[PDB]
Amino acid sequence: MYQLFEELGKGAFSVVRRCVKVLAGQEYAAKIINTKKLSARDHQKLEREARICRLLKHPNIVRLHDSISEEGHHYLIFDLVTGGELFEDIVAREYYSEADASHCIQQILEAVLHCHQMGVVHRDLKPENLLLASKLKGAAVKLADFGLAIEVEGEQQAWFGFAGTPGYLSPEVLRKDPYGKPVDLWACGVILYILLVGYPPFWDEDQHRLYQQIKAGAYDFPSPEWDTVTPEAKDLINKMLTINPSKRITAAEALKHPWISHRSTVASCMHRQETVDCLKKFNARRKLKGAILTTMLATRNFSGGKSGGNKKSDGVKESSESTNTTIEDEDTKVRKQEIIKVTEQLIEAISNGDFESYTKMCDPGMTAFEPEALGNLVEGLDFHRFYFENLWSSKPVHTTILNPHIHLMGDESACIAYIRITQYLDAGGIPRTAQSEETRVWHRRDGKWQIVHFHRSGA
Amino acid sequence: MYQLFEELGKGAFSVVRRCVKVLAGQEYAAKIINTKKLSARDHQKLEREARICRLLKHPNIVRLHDSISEEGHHYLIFDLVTGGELFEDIVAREYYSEADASHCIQQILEAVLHCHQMGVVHRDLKPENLLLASKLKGAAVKLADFGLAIEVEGEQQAWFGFAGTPGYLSPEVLRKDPYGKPVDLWACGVILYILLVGYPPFWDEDQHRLYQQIKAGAYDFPSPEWDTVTPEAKDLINKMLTINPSKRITAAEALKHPWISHRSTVASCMHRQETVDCLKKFNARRKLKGAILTTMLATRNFSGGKSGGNKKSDGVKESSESTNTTIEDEDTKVRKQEIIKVTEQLIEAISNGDFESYTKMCDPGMTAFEPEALGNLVEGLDFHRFYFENLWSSKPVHTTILNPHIHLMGDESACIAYIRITQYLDAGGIPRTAQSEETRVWHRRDGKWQIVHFHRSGA
């Protein structure tokens, strides 16, 4: 059904690759999950993932088009978004302000609101899920990958398991409390914070200490970098990083916060180069912490090409190697014989009165000096046509070429000079003979020798 | 004094590099020891290493030429041997028999005998110290690197320290007994054994167990591979791998052993492919042990393989239009003008009667059709010399070129045709005028346009 092309990204248990639907000619992202490496439970919960992703239809959420299981693999086929990570893109930009971070978070909150309204909680919101739609300027931010997402019943809270990514885990998940939609607003607070200053609010080498920090809500806004952040951006972060989920801002309420809904009078317009610089290091530390799959069993993409243009074959090499040095300077020249071939064909074409073959061997802008031109230079083949039509269209005539000399001037140019003697009969012969001295200038154009100019004397 | 070139090998505390003595023009191996990484004691014992290596003059031992200390480095400059390791070379050979291993061990024992006679014990004999003199067929085996070597007093034994390489350590060193020359004969037994079957006599993942094996002398000659080894090769190994150093064969006695001294009637001539195959893996395991710590100026990427792909670009370049406005729009390659230049210089050279400049612009084998040749084809410049000498060496004469046409036939070939009109005076002028139709065939040879053939009419 599909054809897999380049890899776009990875997880521990999946890769994502561009693919093309064979019969459609439409391109998609294939999430390829190695089901041999999953627990029975995580394999089974792929049914829930597939279902959640079909439900979700929103401009800031990548949607599922298809789901396929084979013996060792499951395939979840989504829309292709080609801009890569938001976070990578932010560091390559010429300007980045609070006003620009607000537009990022608004798009994320719109997506999250839509999830929550459909009874879906993402549970594992992090920078890796934040993709750009395309490489075009101002492409939309899009949520991608809901592999840890859950379905909830209205506003009911439950214990859905300990799942998430350490730095983005909510206090309630860490306290083992029943939970729901607010877990995603905590993670948005962590993302917003990183979007403003380029580093996370909670970090510790010791994971147990990290969790105590999260549960305590022990983040800060240190100078110098927070001194130029507006009080309203800090207020929104505070409202999201509220320890008690019943008191945490919802996605609907966050979207009405002035730093989002009154962005144009509230959010700062100042470029934050230090954020861009810190985010580079953040981005880099995220790409070292990882793992690699053992094997790479893959299919073969279409291969080959047709050759472009015409190339000369040339003389075949006599052997792979020999004692005698290759390319000796003094040797018999076949090339001169090639010129002799096209020249004999020329003389035969003139003798037979075949203007058709004479045209092929001559350049359309052929130059000519001949006694029939009375000392003038003639261009084209119109002039010799009068002799092809009238005279040569026919008593016995014998031509004789004497003392031919050939000058080879590269692969594509040559010149031959010789004496032509013609034996013929005039009226009631009386056999006659005539001499002329002829020069032909040959030039190979597109793999074919053509006369560019010729000179004749005494005829 | 010296110039360092490529690296040849390494240790933990030294690299070896080819170098050239600036004022000599002689090449050597420089052992470069980073003295900042040595203990005070090992730095000090470089004096002993330098001394031992000057003492030793033998055909199967690489000798020291010079010793230099700088602030962070010591340099021990030795003869360059270019064949690499014996062991690497054995696996690339077309044939390898007991008789060939006997020749290896004889050379090693000769070197060791010479050490022992000079009161030097190597202490760390191993495959890495066994180098070939050159890449020539039958190059000698040479001992290289005596960094753990000691000086002994006659036949006196002492405790010189625990030093060596685990697999080659003698029982007496492991028992902490005073020791001397026999430690090197134990290591030769281990080397001989590896030379015969391609694997070591003592091996264990657990170093403490390895040492108990060594101290017990618990090696064996298992079938199938030892079944075709002669009893005399096994006898020599047994004599060397004798636990009690007072009973171990000496280097002098080993050299008189029939498997060495009667090689031609005693040592088998049968190719041992299984030894060659095992030795490949042995060689590979020796080159990949992980270092305990890694220290370097740059991370370092290895260079090798091939350089395929990289197709060359076509290279055509567009010509910018002149910025000043032009009344008529024309744009031929300045190449046509180049032909016009050399042609005008030709006409001026003929007019001035300058045969010198005329010779340069003409090919030595120039072809010519002209009325002065009476319908014949003339080769060379001898024919026109008569006109340069006599006539042109001189009344007022004016030349006029009419209707020039140029055919460009590649970068190296061109052809120009034109009408030449000459105004002159005959006897007592009476101004006269003459017409001729001329064709020149130019060819660039070694960056210079030369006439290969020319044609003239009506002159």
Author numbering:
A (entry chain A), B (entry chain L): 0, 13 to 404, 407 to 472
Sentences from the paper on this structure:
The Ca2+/calmodulin(CaM)-dependent protein kinase II (CaMKII) α isoform is a central mediator of synaptic plasticity that underlies learning, memory and cognition. A hallmark feature of CaMKII regulation is autophosphorylation at T286, which generates Ca2+/CaM-independent ‘autonomous’ kinase activity that persists even when the initial Ca2+-stimulus subsides. The principle domain sequence of a CaMKII subunit is illustrated in, with an N-terminal kinase domain, followed by a short regulatory domain that contains T286, the variable linker domain that is subject to alternative splicing, and the C-terminal hub domain.
A 3D EM density map was obtained at 20 Å resolution by using a combination of tilted-series tomographic imaging and 3D masking routines. The central density of the EM map is well defined by the crystal structure of the dodecameric hub complex, formed by residues 345–472 (cross-correlation=0.95 at 20 Å resolution). The structured N-terminal kinase/regulatory domain, containing residues 13–300, was best fit computationally into each of the radial densities with the regulatory domain (red ribbon in Fig. 2a) oriented towards the central hub complex (cross-correlation=0.98 at 20 Å resolution). Therefore, for the basal-state holoenzyme structure determined here, each N-terminal kinase/regulatory domain was covalently connected to the nearest C-terminal hub domain by a random coil peptide chain, containing residues 301–344 (red and grey coil). The pseudo-atomic model presented here provides a representative average view of the CaMKIIα holoenzyme in an extended (and activatable) conformation. In this form of the holoenzyme, the kinase domains are arranged independently from each other and removed from the central hub complex. Each kinase domain is separated from the central hub complex, extending the radius of the model to ∼135 Å. Neighbouring kinase domains are separated from each other by ∼60 Å (center-to-center distance). In this extended form of the holoenzyme, the CaM-binding sites (residues 294–314, red ribbon/coil) are solvent exposed and thus positioned for activation by the Ca2+/CaM-stimulus. Single particle analysis revealed a high degree of flexibility for kinase domain positioning, with almost none of the individual particles completely matching the average structure.
